[PDB]
Amino acid sequence: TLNGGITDMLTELANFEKNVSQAIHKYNAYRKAASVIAKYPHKIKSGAEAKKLPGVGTKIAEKIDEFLATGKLRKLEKIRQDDTSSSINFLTRVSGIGPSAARKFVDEGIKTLEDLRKNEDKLNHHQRIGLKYFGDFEKRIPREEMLQMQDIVLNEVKKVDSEYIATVCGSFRRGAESSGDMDVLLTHPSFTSESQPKLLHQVVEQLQKVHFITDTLSKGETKFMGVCQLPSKDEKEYPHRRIDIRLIPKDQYYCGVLYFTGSDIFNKNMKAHALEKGFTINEYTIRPGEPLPVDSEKDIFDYIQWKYREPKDRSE
DNA sequence: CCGACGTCGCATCAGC
DNA sequence: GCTGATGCGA
DNA sequence: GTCGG
Ligand SMILES: Nc1ncnc2c1ncn2[C@H]1C[C@H](O)[C@@H](COP(=O)(O)CP(=O)(O)OP(=O)(O)O)O1
Ligand SMILES: [Mn+2]
Ligand SMILES: [Mn+2]
Ligand SMILES: [Mn+2]
Ligand SMILES: [Mn+2]
Ligand code: NA
Ligand code: NA
Ligand code: NA
Ligand code: NA
Ligand code: NA
Numbered sequence: 001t002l003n004g005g006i007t008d009m010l011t012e013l014a015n016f017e018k019n020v021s022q023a024i025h026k027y028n029a030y031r032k033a034a035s036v037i038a039k040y041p042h043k044i045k046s047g048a049e050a051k052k053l054p055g056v057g058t059k060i061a062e063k064i065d066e067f068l069a070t071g072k073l074r075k076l077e078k079i080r081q082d083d084t085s086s087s088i089n090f091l092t093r094v095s096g097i098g099p100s101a102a103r104k105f106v107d108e109g110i111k112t113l114e115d116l117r118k119n120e121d122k123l124n125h126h127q128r129i130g131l132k133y134f135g136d137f138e139k140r141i142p143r144e145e146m147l148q149m150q151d152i153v154l155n156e157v158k159k160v161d162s163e164y165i166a167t168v169c170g171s172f173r174r175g176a177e178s179s180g181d182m183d184v185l186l187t188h189p190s191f192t193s194e195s196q197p198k199l200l201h202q203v204v205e206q207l208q209k210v211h212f213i214t215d216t217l218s219k220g221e222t223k224f225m226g227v228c229q230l231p232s233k234d235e236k237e238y239p240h241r242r243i244d245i246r247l248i249p250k251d252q253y254y255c256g257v258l259y260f261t262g263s264d265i266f267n268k269n270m271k272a273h274a275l276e277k278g279f280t281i282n283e284y285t286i287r288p289g290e291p292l293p294v295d296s297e298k299d300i301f302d303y304i305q306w307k308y309r310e311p312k313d314r315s316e
Numbered sequence: 317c318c319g320a321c322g323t324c325g326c327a328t329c330a331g332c
Numbered sequence: 333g334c335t336g337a338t339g340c341g342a
Numbered sequence: 343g344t345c346g347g
Binding site: 017023025026027028029030032033054055056057058059060 | 343345
Binding site for chain 3: 095099
């Protein structure tokens with residue numbers, strides 16, 4: 001809420017560059033600046049103040065000035081009035097419509113949720129589902145419901161095989177009070193770097209059978225993306241939620257939990273002060289080189305001579 | 317001045 | 333019918 | 343768009 005006006009402005013610019021301009025490096029530039037400003041412990045009084053911060057340069061400092069003086073950005077006003085820009089931006093809010101599909105839809109006069117309904121025939125399976133749950137997928141998930149969902153996931157996974165280990169990561173694991181979705185990391189001792197054909201399928205199938213998973217967006221041997229829903233009390237239906245399950249080699253569990261706990265910006269940063277310290281971290285391993293042994297998230301921190309950050313202190 | 321700035325599993329579908 | 337090219341969410 | 347070459 002502190003430099004919230006500015007970070008909102010920047011995120012909106014980011015989204016425009018990604019969805020309309022298809023300029024992914026400006027999108028990332030804008031998010032990097034929003035992130036460095038969100039972490040700043042002072043109320044920014046000028047663009048020059050922001051300019052001191054890494055990731056904030058000449059053009060963003062100048063936009064910060066306009067915003068502080070005026071309480072708006074003209075270019076964002078100009079964007080939001082443009083019919084093509086605003087329509088493409090809107091449509092990308094549907095899961096399964098990205099910058100390319102949105103643009104093609106808008107080009108052929110399909111620019112609203114009603115137009116999408118009227119044109120279901122031109123939608124693929126993922127986009128029809130994105131449209132069906134358009135509102136639901138934009139609602140956040142209260143931590144209380146994340147706990148209910150957690151217990152159901154871990155429980156049903158155990159019912160398939162007691163040796164599976166399921167871990168809810170993402171914002172949930174960072175201790176957020178609401179989450180955009182549920183991300184589940186799965187492991188099983190039968191699956192490691194060296195050694196599975198139905199390991200994930202068995203878990204998805206069980207979750208469908210107890211009617212927790214309601215839809216499938218994509219599913220392979222290591223990655224499920226779908227829809228789920230907590231069961232209802234006469235009382236009101238819960239909204240449908242996005243759920244991601246990843247099946248990961250047991251011996252890369254800690255690098256995976258680290259990565260899939262995030263945040264995305266944090267992961268970018270840690271990777272930075274690992275490269276600076278003689279290391280390469282990816283979702284699977286830390287290497288100097290062959291993969292160094294790891295027995296905790298802490299270890300990866302130690303390696304790169306960072307003090308351990310709790311999941312909570314990672315939402316950056 | 318200017319090149320770097322994430323890579324990937326999974327789904328669809330022109331163009332043969 | 334097939335698959336290399338492309339798009340999606342991440 | 344930004345920053346280090
Ligand atoms: N661009 C990126 N770079 C590095 N890591 C990335 C990443 N995008 C996602 N991740 C990783 C970390 C997320 O916490 C984790 C989940 O990705 P997610 O897309 O479900 C976003 P999350 O952090 O869970 O918050 P929320 O909005 O869902 O409540 O996957
Ligand atoms: Mn219409
Ligand atoms: Mn998430
Ligand atoms: Mn997710
Ligand atoms: Mn292929
Ligand atoms: Na200070
Ligand atoms: Na700067
Ligand atoms: Na989308
Ligand atoms: Na999301
Ligand atoms: Na420079």
